[PDB]
Amino acid sequence: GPVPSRARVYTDVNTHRPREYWDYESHVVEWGNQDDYQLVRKLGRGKYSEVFEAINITNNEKVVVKILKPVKKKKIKREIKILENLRGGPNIITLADIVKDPVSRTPALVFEHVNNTDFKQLYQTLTDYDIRFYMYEILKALDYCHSMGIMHRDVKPHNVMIDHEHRKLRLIDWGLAEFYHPGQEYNVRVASRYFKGPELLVDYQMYDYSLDMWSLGCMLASMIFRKEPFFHGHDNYDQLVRIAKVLGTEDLYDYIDKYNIELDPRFNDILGRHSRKRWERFVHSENQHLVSPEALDFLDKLLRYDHQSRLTAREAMEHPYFYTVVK
Ligand SMILES: O=C(O)c1ccc2c(c1)nc(Nc1cccc(Cl)c1)c1ccncc12
């Protein structure tokens, strides 16, 4: 069958942690006082939850409350344990409390509030320096969670909350995050379409932290080229075709051949043959001020078919692209 794969870094972080650390199913939730929190306004909802702005009446501080929909019980403790494991880490959203909602009869997670600017509006205004600055901040969060044996699996602009006033960033929504264990096969139905790594799109289950680095590359491409999203597929199959029109089909076949993976035969009549493109193809007068040789090389090293070939978060932070960012 498929050739096995291992993360090239933080491979055995969880094997050497106490079982309590990664065995989220055995986690016992510590419950706070639901009366401490008053809901103020609904912010939105996902397939799995509804999110509200709220107020902590013990300190009159703004917080966010995420009421988990009664769906997929298993996922509850997983998200909670991951949040508790990562609490205090650089640019990780802080879980402030966990309470039982009396209406939904499900857990409600209480998070720190970030005074963010919607990415749709924000990406339009980011300068070159801003993109480098915020990329570096995202990498701090990703190197941290990876070093702690966790992959996020849903890196995308919505989940990177940025307070542009105080230049503060938080990686949110760890609802899809998982513990990395060498040799483990994972669900490929993770991440948002435009940010799904080639591993997911070719149904390769033995993936790792490097999935997040593909997603980061997709964000970077959208920012420096001012095209959001960058790979704009109409479904999961067209998504891979869009990628192959840029990275080329020969390197896609090299990738699947390396892992002895077969494409879904439905690609037979949609994939075609495509050359690899040079990144300069995507530069034009309206985005050129965001582009530099350093940006393109960094991007090039994130967006590899082979998850094993991508920059790690730590390697990424060493890139010349970040030399100009004040440390
Ligand atoms: O899920 C979490 O970890 C999570 C954690 C924190 C926030 C969040 C989701 N969603 C927010 N806003 C938001 C905006 C639009 C739609 C939805 Cl559903 C949510 C938000 C805003 C300000 N500060 C923290 C958060």
- Going from N- to C-terminal start, the domains of the chain cover 5-22+114-327, 23-113
Please report where in the chains the tokens 């403790």 appear, as a residue.
77
Q: Is 109 exposed, middle or buried (0-12, 13-18, 19+ CB in 10 A)?
A: buried
CB 179, CB 240: distance < 8 Å: no
Output the residue whose Cα is nearest ligand 1's atom 17: 44
Distances (CA, A) of 158 to 37, 88, 169, 174: 24, 21, 12, 12
Q: Return the closest-CA partner of residue 153 out of 98, 91, 211, 66.
A: 211
| 45 in contact with ligand 1, CB cutoff 6 A | yes
Method: X-ray
Instruction: Give dist(CA 27, CA 9) in Å, integer.
Output: 27
What CATH architecture is 23-113? 2-Layer Sandwich (3.30)
Resolution (A): 1.6
Q: Is 159 helix (H, G, I), strand (E, B) or coil?
A: helix
Mutate which of 109, 165, 172, 174 for ligand 1 pocket (most atoms within 8 A of beta carbon): 172
| 64 in contact with ligand 1, CB cutoff 6 A | yes
Instruction: Give dist(CA 137, CA 140) in Å, integer.
Output: 5
| Helix, strand, coil share (%) of the chain residues, nearest 5 | 40, 15, 45
What are the structure tokens assigned to 300, written together?
A: 């090039």
Cβ contacts of residue 274 below 8 Å, gap of 6+?
Answer: 244, 245, 248, 249
What CATH architecture is 5-22+114-327? Orthogonal Bundle (1.10)
Instruction: Give dist(CA 214, CA 209) in Å, integer.
Output: 10
| DSSP structure class, residue 156 | S
CA 242 to chain centre: 20
Of 97, 143, 154, 212, the active-site residue reads 154
Output the residue whose Cα is nearest ligand 1's atom 10: 51
According to the annotation, is 50 in a ligand binding site?
yes
Instruction: Give dist(CA 174, CA 167) in Å, integer.
Output: 22
Instruction: Give dist(CA 61, CA 156) in Å, integer.
Output: 27
| 319 in contact with ligand 1, CB cutoff 6 A | no
Please report where in the chains the tokens 């969880």 appear, as a residue.
14
The DSSP bridge pattern shows strands 49-56 and 61-68 to be: antiparallel
Query: DSSP string of 260-285?
Result: T----GGGGGT----PPPPGGGG--T
53 Cα: distance to centroid of ligand 1 (angstroms): 8
What are the structure tokens assigned to 57, written together?
A: 């009446």
Query: DSSP string of 301-312?
Result: HH--SSGGGSPP
According to the annotation, is 272 in a ligand binding site?
no
| 131 in contact with ligand 1, CB cutoff 6 A | no
Instruction: Give dist(CA 244, CA 277) in Å, integer.
Output: 10
2 Cα: distance to centroid of ligand 1 (angstroms): 38
Q: Return the closest-CA partner of residue 243 out of 202, 191, 198.
A: 198
CB 152, CB 142: distance < 8 Å: yes
Ligand 1, atom nearest to 45 Cα: 18
| 43 in contact with ligand 1, CB cutoff 6 A | yes
Ligand 1, atom nearest to 115 Cα: 22
Mutate which of 68, 111, 169 for ligand 1 pocket (most atoms within 8 A of beta carbon): 111
Q: What are phi and psi of 110, to 5 degrees?
A: -110, 120
| 161 in contact with ligand 1, CB cutoff 6 A | yes
212 carries an active-site annotation: no
Mutate which of 43, 94, 116, 168 for ligand 1 pocket (most atoms within 8 A of beta carbon): 43
Q: Is 76 helix (H, G, I), strand (E, B) or coil?
A: helix
Q: Return the closest-CA partner of residue 83 out of 136, 16, 144.
A: 144
According to the annotation, is 73 in a ligand binding site?
no
What are the structure tokens assigned to 153, written together?
A: 């699996």
| 50 in contact with ligand 1, CB cutoff 6 A | no
Helix axes 210-224, 293-302, angle to 10 degrees: 150
Instruction: Give dist(CA 272, CA 263) in Å, integer.
Output: 13
Q: Return the closest-CA partner of residue 126 out of 86, 88, 167.
A: 167
Q: Return the closest-CA partner of residue 231 out of 248, 218, 247.
A: 218
Q: Return the closest-CA partner of residue 241 out of 249, 251, 230.
A: 249
CB 141, CB 159: distance < 8 Å: no
Q: Is 100 helix (H, G, I), strand (E, B) or coil?
A: strand
